[PDB]
């Protein structure tokens, strides 16, 4: 009983998960080849009209800075008023980092508000191998959820990933999410128009447009960006040859 152990020793049960030959590396190789150059834009999203972000996106990764990450923050009031449906493609995916509190409920409201249904729930399970409190909390919270949503109505790329990410709990005040979420997303081969809202200089990445208030530089040009998906490139999965 690892629960009983955690009560006795402070080692989270997930410290005891181990190992966390079909090589899905040509996928990652094909992704790398089709990736657009990284594009990024400093923008104060509370003051910025997201409709300027074109074309519509096949994938949106939404990482609002929640108050619970710190122990400008966005409340679920602010997040729910983002017009995400105005930039999402009719068939597209969202990945929303929800924290571990009321966000598990309000994030689902958001997804429905914006026209998606939740398809998966990706749990970021944080180990404390190197270092063995909400008022409403019944339990010590040791994980965060990233909700996957689909909207709208295969290929050669199948599912290879599990819905858990296991890493060590980062140092206090480190708000970065595990880069492994980018891998789960890119492994799907969802399309090439990928947007990361509330990204940072540290999260900029090939194949993605990053938009955030703390970016120090911008290179986004709406016409240049759209040219990466012009014919005959419009409908690629991101996982096929150039």
């Amino acid at each position: 009983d690892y629960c009983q152990h955690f009560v006795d020793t402070g080692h989270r049960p997930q410290n005891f998960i181990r190992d966390v030959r079909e090589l899905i590396r040509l996928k990652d190789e094909l992704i790398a080849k089709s990736n657009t150059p990284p594009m990024y834009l400093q923008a104060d999203i509370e003051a910025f009209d997201i409709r300027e972000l074109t074309p519509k996106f096949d994938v949106i990764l939404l990482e609002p800075p929640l108050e619970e990450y710190y122990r400008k923050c966005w409340t679920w009031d602010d997040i729910m008023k983002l017009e995400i449906d105005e930039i999402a493609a009719p068939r597209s995916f969202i990945f929303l980092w929800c924290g571990s509190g009321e966000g598990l409920d309000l994030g689902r409201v958001c997804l429905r508000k914006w026209g998606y249904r939740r398809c998966e729930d990706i749990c970021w399970i944080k180990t404390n191998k190197n270092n063995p409190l909400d008022p409403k909390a019944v339990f010590q919270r040791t994980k965060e959820h990233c909700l996957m949503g689909i909207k709208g109505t295969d290929f050669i790329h199948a599912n290879v990933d599990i819905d858990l990410i296991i890493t060590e709990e980062p140092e206090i005040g480190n708000i970065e999410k595990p880069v492994e979420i980018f891998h789960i997303i890119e492994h799907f081969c969802l399309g090439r128009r990928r947007l990361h809202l509330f990204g940072r200089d540290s999260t900029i990445r090939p194949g993605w447009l990053t938009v955030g208030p703390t970016l120090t530089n911008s290179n986004y040009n709406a016409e240049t960006y759209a040219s990466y998906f012009s014919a005959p490139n419009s409908y690629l999965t991101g996982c096929t040859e150039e």
Partner: protein
């Protein structure tokens, strides 16, 4: 009365008002996502609200019941204040549509203002071995006992292996009726003087 008790019944039809109040409710419903499943309306209509005044509810959910169970939770009068994740491993501590599923979810709801519970002793991740397809991990009962020691608890849709001390277990594949608490026995005999639960 400390030792295990159970009632073989259709939980749709049992009059649960006879059971008293419980510090903890746990339910592992047969969501309609087959054997003896309940429709969404039947789940909504279950008389959970009479089971507690102040306490916690543990609700296992998968697939679209992740949303449906949140609805039920709120309809029955609970706020979801935690969510337990059971990471599924084999005997060697390795993890067993768009993603392969390595975990199972249990919502934690609160009703009223529970007092004297040991909140924060356990964390919200369980790591435990899979057994039969239908077998929740027995670690949940220890977390619940440490959270609320000695108090009365009730399980909905349990199976014979789930009967535990301090717990009354309900389900339609239990063996008859086994009741030991004198207050429950009295109210049961009054409600069901010929020992049959219909309609």
């Amino acid at each position: 009365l400390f030792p295990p008790q159970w009632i073989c019944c259709d939980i749709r039809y049992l009059d649960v008002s006879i059971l008293g109040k419980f510090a903890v409710v746990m339910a592992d419903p047969p969501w309609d996502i087959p054997y003896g499943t309940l429709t969404d309306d039947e789940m909504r209509r279950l008389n959970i609200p009479v089971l507690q005044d102040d306490g916690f509810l543990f609700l296992w959910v998968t697939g679209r019941a992740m949303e449906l169970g949140r609805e039920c939770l709120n309809l029955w009068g609970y706020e979801r204040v935690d969510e337990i994740i059971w990471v599924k491993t084999n005997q060697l501590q390795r993890i067993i549509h768009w993603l392969n599923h390595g975990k199972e979810h249990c919502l934690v709801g609160v009703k009223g203002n529970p007092q004297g519970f040991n909140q924060g002793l356990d964390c919200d991740v369980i790591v435990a071995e899979v057994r039969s397809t239908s077998h929740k991990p027995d670690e949940i009962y220890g977390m619940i006992e440490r959270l609320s020691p000695g108090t009365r608890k009730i399980e909905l849709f349990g199976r014979p292996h789930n009967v535990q001390p301090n717990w009354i277990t309900l389900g339609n594949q239990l063996d008859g009726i086994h009741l030991l608490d004198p207050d429950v026995v009295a109210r049961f005999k009054q409600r069901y003087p010929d020992g049959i639960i219909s309609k």
